[PDB]
Write a protein that binds this ligand. Structure first.
Ligand SMILES: O=C(O)CC[C@H](NCC(=O)[C@@H](O)[C@H](O)[C@H](O)CO)C(=O)O
Ligand SMILES: [Ca+2]
Ligand SMILES: [Ca+2]
Ligand SMILES: [Ca+2]
Length: 326
């Protein structure tokens, strides 16, 4: 009953955070914690709106942070909770603290296409050149943008294109056109990793760590950082969290470089605290799999939380229609 409740999205990502961050930080603070899993931020919104908040800390994506904050789902974090200078600019807000960088990328089945798989969004959406079963997320972040890239929008103009009603409509029409070839709308990263390990799909748009984990487990898949979305994951405290003050201390501790340095040990992720890189001498194999590595950054575009602050509601509704029509 004294336990701080921490919730992430499960699988290898939750295990990495638990092993590297939660278990050692709790021990150092003499605190006890309970874990939970969720896939959609609207589940935290439901707890707040019902007046029955059970979660303390929620790991969320940076583009969900503006709509969660606007809806009164997040607590305002104590002022000097982290040294913002240790983190990438914008990765720390008044209600969110980054823990990692990751990518929403293309992976393909080598049994189906060999080395000649889809290497861009245009290729992924091309059913004639690449016939086969596609897998997309059942949520729109990284999916709406993948359709904009498939339409031939340059990476640096993704959100400029999506700031227009015309651009937004064309991206939805592009997802609708691909929907007949989508065999599964995956819900969790562990389910996406399982589809890869079983070869149940020919191509998938999912998170890099999940892909790499499946490949390490023996999946006959390949992937590319080309046209991938560079994302930021982090922590927020739920408005009216039962253990608000203990959660705040837990968050301050787990954000330190001494814990962050261990996050890539069992999972292909990139720690958000820059001091972690000075503390840990990562292997070249590990470096190459990190989303925030310079060679990988060059072929990606960053997620824009300002776009999602404005059009998340329209996107969620329009994307639901693409999926429910097939
Ligand atoms: O940061 C990482 O390394 C993990 C990347 C990836 N997390 C994606 C992610 O932003 C969401 O699961 C997010 O937490 C929810 O949609 C709620 O905002 C994963 O589960 O694989
Ligand atoms: Ca997940
Ligand atoms: Ca996994
Ligand atoms: Ca941006």
């Amino acid at each position: 009953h004294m336990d701080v409740v921490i919730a992430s999205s499960g699988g290898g990502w939750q295990e990495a955070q638990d092993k590297a961050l939660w278990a050692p930080a709790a021990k150092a603070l003499n605190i006890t914690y309970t874990q939970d899993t969720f896939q959609n931020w609207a589940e935290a919104r439901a707890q707040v709106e019902s007046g029955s908040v059970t979660w303390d800390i929620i790991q969320i994506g940076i583009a969900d942070e503006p709509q969660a904050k606007a809806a009164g789902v997040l607590e305002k974090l104590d002022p000097d909770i982290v040294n913002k200078a240790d983190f990438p600019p914008g990765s720390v807000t008044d209600s969110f603290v980054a823990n990692s960088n990751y990518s929403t990328l293309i992976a393909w089945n080598k049994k189906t296409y060999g080395d000649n798989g889809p290497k861009s969004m245009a290729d992924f959406f091309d059913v004639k050149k690449f016939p086969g079963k596609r897998a997309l997320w059942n949520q729109p972040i990284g999916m709406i943008e993948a359709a904009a890239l498939a339409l031939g929008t340059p990476r640096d103009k993704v959100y400029e294109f999506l700031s227009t009603e015309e651009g937004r409509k064309a991206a939805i029409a592009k997802l609708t056109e691909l929907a007949p070839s989508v065999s599964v709308w995956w819900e969790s990263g562990a389910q996406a990793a399982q589809l890869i390990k079983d070869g149940e799909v020919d191509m998938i748009i999912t998170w890099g760590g999940r892909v790499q984990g499946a490949i390490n487990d023996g999946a006959n898949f390949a992937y590319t950082f080309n046209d991938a979305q560079l994302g930021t994951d982090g922590y927020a405290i739920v408005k009216g969290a039962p253990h608000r003050d203990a959660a705040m201390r837990f968050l301050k501790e787990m954000s330190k470089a001494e814990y962050q340095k261990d996050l890539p040990n069992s999972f292909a992720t990139a720690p958000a605290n820059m001091k972690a890189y000075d503390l840990a001498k990562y292997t070249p194999e590990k470096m190459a799999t990190m989303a925030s590595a310079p060679e990988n950054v060059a072929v990606q575009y960053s997620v824009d939380p300002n776009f999602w602050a404005k059009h998340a509601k329209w996107a969620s509704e329009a994307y639901d229609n693409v999926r429910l029509s097939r």
